Amino acid sequence: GSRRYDSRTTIFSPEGRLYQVEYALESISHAGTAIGIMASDGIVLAAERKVTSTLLEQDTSTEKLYKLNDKIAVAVAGLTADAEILINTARIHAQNYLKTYNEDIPVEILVRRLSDIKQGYTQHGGLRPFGVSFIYAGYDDRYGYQLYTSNPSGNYTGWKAISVGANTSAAQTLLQMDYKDDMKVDDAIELALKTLSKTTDSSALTYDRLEFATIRKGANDGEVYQKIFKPQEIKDILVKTGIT
Amino acid sequence: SDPSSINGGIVVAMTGKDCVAIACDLRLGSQSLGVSNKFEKIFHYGHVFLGITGLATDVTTLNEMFRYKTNLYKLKEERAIEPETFTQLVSSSLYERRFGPYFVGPVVAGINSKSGKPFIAGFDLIGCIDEAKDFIVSGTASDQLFGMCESLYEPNLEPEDLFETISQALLNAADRDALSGWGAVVYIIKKDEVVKRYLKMRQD
Amino acid sequence: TGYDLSNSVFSPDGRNFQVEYAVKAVENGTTSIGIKCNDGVVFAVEKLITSKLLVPQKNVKIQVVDRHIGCVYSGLIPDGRHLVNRGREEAASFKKLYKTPIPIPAFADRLGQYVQAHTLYNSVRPFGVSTIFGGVDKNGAHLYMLEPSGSYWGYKGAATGKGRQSAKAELEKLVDHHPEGLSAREAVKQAAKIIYLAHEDNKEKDFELEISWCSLSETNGLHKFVKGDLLQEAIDFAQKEIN
Amino acid sequence: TQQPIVTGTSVISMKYDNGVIIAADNLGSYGSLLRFNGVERLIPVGDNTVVGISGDISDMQHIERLLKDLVTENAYDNPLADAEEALEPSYIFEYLATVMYQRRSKMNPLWNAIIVAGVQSNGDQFLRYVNLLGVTYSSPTLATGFGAHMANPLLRKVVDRESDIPKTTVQVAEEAIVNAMRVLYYRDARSSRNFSLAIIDKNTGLTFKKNLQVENMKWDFAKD
Amino acid sequence: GYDRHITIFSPEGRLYQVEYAFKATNQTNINSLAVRGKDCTVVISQKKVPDKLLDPTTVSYIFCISRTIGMVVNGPIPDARNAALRAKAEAAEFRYKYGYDMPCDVLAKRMANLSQIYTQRAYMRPLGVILTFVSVDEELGPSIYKTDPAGYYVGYKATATGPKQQEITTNLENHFKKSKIDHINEESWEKVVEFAITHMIDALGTEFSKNDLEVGVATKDKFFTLSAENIEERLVAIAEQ
Amino acid sequence: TSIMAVTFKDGVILGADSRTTTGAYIANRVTDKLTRVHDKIWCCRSGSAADTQAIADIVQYHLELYTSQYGTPSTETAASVFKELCYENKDNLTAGIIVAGYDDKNKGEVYTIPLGGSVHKLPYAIAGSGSTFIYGYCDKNFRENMSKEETVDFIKHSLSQAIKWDGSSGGVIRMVVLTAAGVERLIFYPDEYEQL
Amino acid sequence: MTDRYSFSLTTFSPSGKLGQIDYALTAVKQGVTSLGIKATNGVVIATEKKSSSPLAMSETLSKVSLLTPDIGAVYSGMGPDYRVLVDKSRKVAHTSYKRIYGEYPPTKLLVSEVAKIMQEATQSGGVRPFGVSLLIAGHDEFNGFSLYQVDPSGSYFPWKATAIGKGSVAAKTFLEKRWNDELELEDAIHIALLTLKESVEGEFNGDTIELAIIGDENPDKGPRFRKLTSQEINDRLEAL
Amino acid sequence: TTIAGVVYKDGIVLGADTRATEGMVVADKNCSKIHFISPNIYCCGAGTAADTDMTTQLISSNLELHSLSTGRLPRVVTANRMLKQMLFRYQGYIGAALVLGGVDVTGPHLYSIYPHGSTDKLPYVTMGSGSLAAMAVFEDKFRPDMEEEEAKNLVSEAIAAGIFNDLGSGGNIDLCVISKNKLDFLRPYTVPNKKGTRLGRYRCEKGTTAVLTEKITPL
Ligand SMILES: *[C@@H](CS(C)(=O)=O)[C@H](Cc1ccc(CN)cc1)NC(=O)[C@H](CC1CCCCC1)NC(=O)[C@H](CC(C)C)NC(=O)c1cnc(C)s1
Ligand SMILES: [Cl-]
Ligand SMILES: [Mg+2]
Ligand SMILES: [Mg+2]
Ligand SMILES: [Mg+2]
């Protein structure tokens, strides 16, 4: 029968690792680097696009930074299509929670949910896991500003600064070196871009190879605003910080 | 017994010159017993306003449902829903409960952000669209509102002329209905400002 | 290679080796035949007497479908029974809806499509039987033979099992020597002979002859087993021809 | 739940010394309209059983097909289908009884009253009733619907208890049945003159008589 | 090498089970041809009855799908009959749901979409058949549409299928290069059948008797297959000129 | 409705009025109640128009698919398909259908399927609301093996009376003749049949 | 019959590759060249009608498909796979969008829906990925003109201009030189015909080329999708 | 509602009034009841307005998908079947009463479809509460093979009969003329009633209404 052709995606190796999770992480290690940095007055999400031609329409393009609700965004590293499946599930969970309790979903609860979905693919069903790692940038009125990551295993953790995708080893050392707890958004913007500028496999870091976003409470009357940066704005912030 | 007239209340909407107005009373009751005088029946999803009369549990449920749907719409489309599009969404959503309907009388109001055209619409409980330019009425004093609107209304009113028209239409209709009144709200909606006014009316 | 390990896999030839392996089980079985006559059909089969302990005339191989169709098969006997059970369900549903008893060509395709379905998936095994069947319908007599692949055709005579080549040669002589046709009682006698001649390929053990027939004149278009005097008359005719 | 539309009236029957007799008129009524005058309501099964059916005719036709199908099915892989493993009256009855009670229990009954008359392997007379409720009973005389009220009283005067069955000849029994069919024709508004009668004897086998008529009709006292 | 056993991609981007199903197509060793007239579509196919014990009337690879649609199959008979039964069912369902007779191309596309599913889903094997559908469509006129195990389908001016398809194809190509029209400019179907048979004789280099051919003809509002005697009449007319 | 099918020497003729009412309103006065399920197997429809239309379409489908596989179906087979639908869905249907057809073997055949879902094979059949009024007339005037002209006159006279007395019936008398010769449609207007 | 293939046939290899997606992309590479170019007042999509036989009527085989009145699609790779994506794209544009909102979906969202279907064939039990890459051109009121590519993985990217299949590497280089942000639709059609001539071996005319545009409304609106006729292509080939 | 259709020489003329009622009250005096099915097929709607609207839209949508797959214009019989089979399945609970008219490859066809799933194929039909008023006009004046402007007048006259004599019907007269060469969607064809002129201005002057509080938010 069919047993002959079954890869068995949900088994342990003799060492006690999940083959497909490990190989999915290997996939994600080749994806464009995404960085999240949490400041006292906001969060920065920066991410590097990949391959890019001069003919790619950048202003209508979204491969890295996605919006889950008005308070929570994600940076993606891995299969974009796999991410979009999970993103739309998350977007629904947030609205189910809003409908039930008449309050916006707390960031951790959303993150756990998605992470639990990812976990399920590693323990049952016989399907391949999602080849995606998320950085979640969000705000709620319990914990304030929060950064999390999840990976194909379904494990998630909280961070002050973090990278996913390519060159995370190098990126995490550079962040660990220059990050400080009293840091502000404008400084974190600069740190994020400087880290990508050194870890990039491209010759130089330009506006057309970047997606960029900030979650600031820095708004009138203490309300959270998500800013997905336009191509021209990423170009301006690259000149301001002195990279180009 | 009749679900559309347990809780009571009304909504009316009108068009003017480069503006729309939508208004509602504030009553919620259990038939004869008045319970709340802070039960607003007008909601908004971006720049599109939705009034809903009828069974209050369904009014609440539908508001929550259209908030849900319009939020996902905005995330996917990367723009706020327009009145024309929303009207169709309401109709769809009502008709998918054709044989177990929401006991409601919805009313859409808003200005199309691109064309600038003032828009209103109304529905029966199963989603048939009343698509009239002049005015839309709904609730336990709908007959009363139809009469008031037909005699008071005229086209192309300026925002503060239209306010006086819709307010007098609501107030005088509500005062001839046992299950409407207990306060009232009037939204005057323009292309980039919305004025919300609470009206002084008799509290019986 | 590996193309023969799984059913419904095309080899590089364009063949389904599992079906061809089912044919080997069919070729391993006892001899069964079918003869189309003037107004009907005759079926006969070789039943190997493995032991003296077998009760004579009790282990019946030929099966009836509806009241007008006879089925006989060579190979894996249970697979044949399974196919006949399905046939009976098909014939029953046909009669329930359309009132008339199932026509033989209609019935042939019902078995055909079902057997062919067991070559479409790796989760099932092909049928280990070639099935000779037929009867009398409104358009007269029909004889069919159905292979593990789902292939079937109409026949003047049919033969399958270990003695098929021997039988086929004898059937071909009858087709040549009787263009105007063979009578039902003649076909019973000839069937007996052909099973007796085809027994030379299974000559180690002795055997038991079993014959059935549908004929418009001799059985009113209903399937009946050849019994008693008519069976003995056919055995005597067969025994005379080998000597 | 339905309602019966085209209907058949009384089926009547009795035991006698060697076998059983059963009879039923050839009418399919459509309410008060005497719609179909050529309806056979005695349906033989093999050469040892006759199933007489009253009530809804569409449901009778369904049961007719079930019995026809039962014969086909019993023949399958059965070398003794015309001998020791042929269908018995008791088997045919029990099947029908099972069906009738199953159908009432799903609230979707076959809207009939049935009498299975036959002779068993060992020569025993079989006569048993079943209806739309699955209710079953046996008696030396059995009759459905209207015949229960008028035929049984007459037939019971011939065979009043079990001990009268050996004393009753086939002639006496057939006369009684035909007499009863006359009485029913005078008095049942939904009956007809034309009927069928079936004798199942342990010696002479199944005799099926068609196109019989009620005769010797007393009307002369009307003129006064 | 399990990429050759089920319908998944090989490293070259190839589905070997689809390719091997195409080879099963020629296992019968039969050549078919289809051409269009003005008022008709004619399909002819080789008939080979190797066994004398066979009833030759039951040996057929032409199928009457609906009254308007005919289908000839190149491939083994069990898969041919699988395909035939389904096409019949689909054509009947179509007429019930949509109230008009299923067009030839709409059936071809439908059967092609089903064939595609077997190339993408692993548990189903492709059928080892090429299906040539013919009709006189009430909108498009004389129609020839062909389906294969890949799930490909396309309309034809004329076509040929089988082991010696390339010979027949080039013969037909050369004729339409001369005439400079998409059809056989002929009033009667009887003469279009004569054309079809003649051009198969020339291409294959073999003479035919009445029992070596099998013919199907589509006209407006009916498709029908010719008897042995109808073909014999057709062969007499060819010989006499 | 007034409908009938009558066997005769050369085959069978179906006949029907053309009136369809919604209460007292005549919604359609030119209704075609004789519907084709196969070349030479037709039916007369009475009862719910929605039900008899839905059934006749399903039967047409079944017989089309029968024909694709097993060749021309018998009139008995058509009647069996009608019955199967009417009997199994008796609780949700109001259909009284007469099935009529011409084989060459069996010649003309008429099957009636009343409300129950029972089948009755008859030399002729009458049905519909207007049929009550002509049981007397039809029983007295029907003979077997009539000629085509006699059978047309028998149906014309019968339905003429059915129409006269039944308000639910009326309009034109349509007929469909089924013989070896083919299928002939006849129509007869009020000015013709009323003066009979 | 049990569909026992409830497990993924596309899995991660030790290197992190998804074999079946890569192999599907190899199938796309072997397919015939198709391209898309975006102008200021329109979009053009084009491909070669590679006729399998001269007896075949290549007009019946449409490589360029209308998905909605304002959205068109072309492909490179396996035709039968494309056909069933076009069917589902057309259907999803009604079920999940038009029957809800009373209007057709914008280009990007229809693209996203197609991408989803393709992704699911990359992860669901018992299926191979689709062996096609799509180029979807379209217009909608709030986004204007747009051009998207969709790959077997489910990944999609918006393009100013691009090409896929056989001679895509050479074609993309050709387009990079010629493209600017001030092209009119006629200029883009001209460039599309030049670019496509490089990858075509044999006959190059209106009968062997399929070319459609998303442009002005052709007379509630008119449809912006328009397939150019065999004559309309040949006219522009004289000014080539 | 008064909806009607006739078959004329070159094609089909459909007609409808424009009054939408909730009980005894008029909600819309100029509503559209002639619905689009396909470019060559339209559908007049009566009965439960929501059922009419969503049944025509669903079949229109499915026919659009059907027509994209086949590449040819859809037929009226297929529109008729799809409406019929759906309405039948729902046993009259979808209260759609349609006049379906269009022009095929096989010529012009006109149907009446009823909520329970019956359809009549006819040269002229009327539906809605004003069907008897409209049908009287057709029985009085219809003849087969009319010219275009004559058929337009007859339908317009039949809808008018409904407008005036039936209380459920009113407002303007919409027509839809369908032939092989054109589709003319005439809305409104006629305005048989002028809107009643008001003699006084009852609009209140600014500051007349009593306000408690106010809030302004920009967008
Ligand atoms: C005339 C048909 S009539 C008088 O012969 O029944 C119109 C037809 C029509 C068609 C399309 C459009 C626009 N999409 C408008 C009008 N039908 C009506 O006006 C409906 C008549 C009702 C009669 C009583 C039984 C229900 C149907 N009216 C409605 O459908 C209204 C919707 C309007 C726009 C407010 N709905 C109701 O009155 C309902 C009350 N309760 C319901 C569950 S629906
Ligand atoms: Cl399909
Ligand atoms: Mg009050
Ligand atoms: Mg497969
Ligand atoms: Mg009358």
Side-chain angles (χ1 to χ4, degrees), chain D residues 14-21 48 89-90 116-128 138-140 159 162 164-168 200-202:
Chain D
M14 70 185 286
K15 295 177 174 182
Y16 66 96
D17 59 21
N18 297 153
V20 294
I21 304 177
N48 73 162
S90 65
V116 177
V119 176
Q120 298 274 111
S121 294
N122 66 343
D124 286 16
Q125 300 99 312
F126 189 91
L127 197 70
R128 205 168 167 83
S138 186
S139 180
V159 290
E162 200 75 13
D164 297 344
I165 295 162
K167 300 170 192 179
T168 315
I200 310 97
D201 194 274
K202 75 179 177 182

Side-chain angles (χ1 to χ4, degrees), chain D residues 97-115:
Chain D
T98 308
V99 171
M100 296 307 268
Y101 184 77
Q102 276 181 186
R103 290 292 295 274
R104 93 92 218 196
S105 298
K106 302 190 321 205
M107 294 294 289
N108 181 225
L110 289 165
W111 211 288
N112 301 96
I114 301 164
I115 290 168

Side-chain angles (χ1 to χ4, degrees), chain D residues 151-163:
Chain D
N152 276 327
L154 299 169
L155 300 174
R156 284 162 186 178
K157 292 157 69 70
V158 184
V159 290
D160 212 31
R161 65 259 314 290
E162 200 75 13
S163 63

Side-chain angles (χ1 to χ4, degrees), chain A residues 197-210:
Chain A
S197 191
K198 294 176 64 162
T199 62
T200 183
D201 297 319
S202 299
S203 57
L205 203 70
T206 48
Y207 78 97
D208 64 308
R209 215 186 328 285
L210 287 173

